Amino acid sequence: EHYIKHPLQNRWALWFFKNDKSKTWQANLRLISKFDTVEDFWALYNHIQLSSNLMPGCDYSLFKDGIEPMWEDEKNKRGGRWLITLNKQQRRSDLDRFWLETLLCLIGESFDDYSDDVCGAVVNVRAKGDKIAIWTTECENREAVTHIGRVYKERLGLPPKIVIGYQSHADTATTKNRFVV
């Protein structure tokens, strides 16, 4: 305890996406690093670019080790995402703050029992508008999905005027909201 790192409930992997139209979507997805302690998280976060600084067309994804940050994964294919859409003003005011909060919600296991329903999260840096999402494992788990949206919204400090939607990945890959908070 004067010398032991603070362990996380999960080992997490940080992924980076840079668009290269000559490659398949999946091939553009590169593992940055894995970590399983609070100290090791900050070490990685402190040395990497803020999302607000990435070239447009890039993502970060943070996923539980063993879960690939893509629809296709077993843990993702029946799942969906809580989506925060940001406008261009929010890149400045909210993107990096919201992304770090989302990271801390994941590594700290902030959704009680339903943190096991969390797969990971992704930040899309886009010229038309940035997005942050939390991916959950099963769009049919009404109580899980719904408790996660609620706590997450509180964590981001979004006002009651803002409404966020949950979309299944089935729909996204073929988008309507299954739930809002």
Binding site: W42, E101, L104, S110
Partner: peptide, 14 residues
């Protein structure tokens, strides 16, 4: 079940 407070995790950043 290992849970961490936002305030605890922030205190660790340096």
């Amino acid at each position: 079940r290992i849970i961490y407070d936002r305030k605890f995790l922030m205190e660790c950043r340096n």
